[PDB]
Design a binder for this molecule. Structure first.
Ligand SMILES: C[C@H](/C=C\C(F)(F)F)Oc1cc(-c2cc(-c3cc(CN(C)C)cs3)cnc2N)ccc1C(N)=O
Length: 253
């Protein structure tokens, strides 16, 4: 369990946080990634907190949660490595940006994939009771699997639920709603320049139908997730009973 067991291929992303690099396990040549963190400038508190968060990621194993592998300490450079699975398809933010740019709507089949696997990711989290549902925290592997990252475990808070906009599992359903919405329409359901304007729109509860290449059923269920009354939003179980969701929309090994 040392850094010498792995070889850096190259950097994927840079912090902020630190650095994110694609790596190769030397023992077998498995492709992984790790997140670089430099704790050299943290108090003992922040370091204890950090060891607390790290112990959390060692707990969750689930086919739709980004899989933790290992933690590596280098007291030499005062650098912490968190090793996880490679998600070659990158994040959803990029897919959404890419579709926005090339003006190409995603396939309903792909939407159903994200809807199905994220819902399962939720049901896992609520059980162990966390992680936030936003396009940047959703990752795609090479097998059409959708995986939830660790974020949350200046910007306009597009995915704020009406309730949390004031003073609840159904709050997550809303955010999921906003996400699939953005995935269909290539833009959030509510947009504004100030947060106050945003809150004005979220409370009115009106938005556009998602594009007509997407079926009525798909739109109905997203619409129901964006209901102002949390009790009218469907449960994880209600979402899965939907005739739209089929075996092939689930995770595969
Ligand atoms: C810091 C990083 C979040 C974004 C960043 F990756 F851009 F930095 O943290 C996580 C990373 C991953 C993760 C991302 C990827 C990516 C692959 C590609 C394109 N390839 C073709 C080169 C762009 S990003 C691959 N595997 C990953 N495990 C997952 C979760 C997190 C997190 N913050 O929990």
């Amino acid at each position: 369990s040392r850094a010498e067991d792995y070889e850096v291929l190259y950097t994927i992303g840079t912090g902020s946080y630190g650095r994110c690099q694609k790596i190769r396990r030397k023992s077998d040549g498995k492709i992984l990634v790790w997140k670089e963190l430099d704790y050299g400038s943290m108090t003992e508190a922040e370091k204890q907190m950090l060891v607390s968060e790290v112990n959390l990621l060692r707990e969750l194993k689930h086919p739709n949660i980004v899989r933790y592998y290992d933690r590596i300490i280098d007291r030499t450079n005062t650098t912490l490595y968190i090793v996880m699975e490679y998600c070659e398809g990158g994040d959803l933010a990029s897919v959404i940006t890419k579709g926005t740019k090339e003006r190409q709507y995603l396939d309903e089949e792909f939407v159903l994939r994200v809807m199905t696997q994220l819902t399962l990711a939720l049901k896992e989290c609520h059980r162990r009771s966390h992680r936030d549902l936003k396009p940047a925290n959703v990752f795609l592997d090479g097998k059409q699997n959708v995986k939830l990252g660790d974020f949350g475990l200046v910007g306009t808070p597009y995915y704020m639920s009406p309730e949390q906009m004031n003073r609840n599992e159904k709050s997550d359903i809303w955010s999921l709603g906003c996400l699939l919405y953005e995935l269909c329409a290539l833009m959030p359901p509510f947009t504004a320049f100030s947060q106050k304007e945003l809150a004005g729109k979220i409370r009115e509860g009106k938005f556009r139908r998602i594009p007509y290449r997407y079926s009525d059923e798909l739109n109905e269920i997203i619409t129901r997730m964006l209901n102002l009354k949390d009790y009218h939003r469907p449960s994880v179980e209600e979402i899965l009973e939907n005739p739209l969701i089929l075996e092939h929309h689930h995770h595969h090994h």
